Symmetry: C2
Subunit: 208 residues, 2 copies
């Protein structure tokens, strides 16, 4: 006899959406640092990378980001391996220095390229700590959706590591073709994209 | 030269904690239904099971839950297999009928036991839909922390499925010893806990 009405069981997303936007605004007001920042620190969380230099493909950023760090070229997260399943949802006291280490690592990948200068990059980051560490993937995904950062949405590959012995069959990523060279990328020998079409995709990113 | 201060990068968890508690209060006010509810429905989300009968181990619930459905015996979540990694963070349009199906399934596991009557069980559930589906694991974990439901924290096993061919080496779960019998549990033939010590753990649950 009891009446069933699905909509009476549906959680309304409005406050959660307001909270995510507040988290983005908190993110935006945090200190911009050099890439990598001047000190190591503990914590997991979310980071953005900004470009303000004049490498020709990217030199529009020197205008977009002339007056404020507005537009990231890249957004990522760093969490301890304990929160990635193998197998668990979240297992341990505290999670060490993933964010700092992941940022420093981007800094060395960039220092390895010839056509990019580390001095043209800055970074913002937010540490999410206890229960708030549940927000990390949501804030990373909201920034990617708001900003559509070039190295997340158009030119893939920046965040990848060595593929793993005998999986050097696939091609190198669009990021490695226009930014040689990490040693490991020289190995791929699939047919990678052509610089030209990567460049046309970049130019497209910037006209809309 | 630029000053580094970690605490300037730390997200404050207070609003997020308020939001989780609001989500729990929303959960608590939703309609209580029979187990399983009178209709199937679409959605992923979070559910709780309540007991109000007189099976002797559990008959304290008939008092705790005499006037209101206050204390769950079990809390779980149901999400599509697409959000569990294999491999992706979240991949597809909408996620079908995991919650309804997971609840119905608990209902049949219970109907298979001799000493439990389906008529002494009720359930509440909340569907989290688009961006709110990010809250599912957080709300499930908050309910487990607030209520410490017996079949989550003391008597393990209710939510398990058949182990998988030649992994019938481990013992049956505490739930299967005091609630025979799902066919598959008869197979384990490790040394399972003794009913007595399970019962003493239950009795302990209820004196504190």
């Amino acid at each position: 006899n009891k009446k069933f009405d699905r909509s009476e069981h549906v959680y309304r997303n409005d406050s959660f959406l307001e909270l995510i936007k507040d988290a983005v605004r908190f993110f935006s007001g945090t200190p911009v640092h050099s890439l990598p920042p001047p000190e190591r620190f503990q914590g997991a969380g979310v980071y953005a990378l900004y470009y303000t230099g004049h490498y020709s493909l990217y030199d529009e950023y020197s205008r977009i980001n002339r007056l404020a760090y507005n537009l990231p070229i890249y957004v990522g997260k760093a969490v301890p391996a304990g929160w990635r399943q193998s197998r668990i949802s979240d297992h341990e006291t505290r999670a060490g220095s993933e964010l700092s280490n992941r940022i420093r690592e981007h800094g060395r990948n960039i220092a390895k390229t010839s056509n990019l200068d580390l001095c043209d990059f800055s970074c913002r980051f937010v540490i999410f700590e206890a229960t708030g560490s549940d927000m990390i993937s949501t804030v990373q995904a909201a920034l990617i959706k708001i900003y559509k950062p070039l190295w997340n949405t158009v030119v893939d590959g920046f965040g990848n590591h060595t593929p793993g012995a005998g999986r050097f069959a696939q091609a190198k990523s669009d990021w490695d073709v226009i930014h040689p060279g990490r040693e490991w990328a020289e190995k791929c020998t699939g047919v990678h994209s052509e610089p030209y079409f990567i460049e046309e995709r970049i130019k497209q990113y910037f006209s809309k």
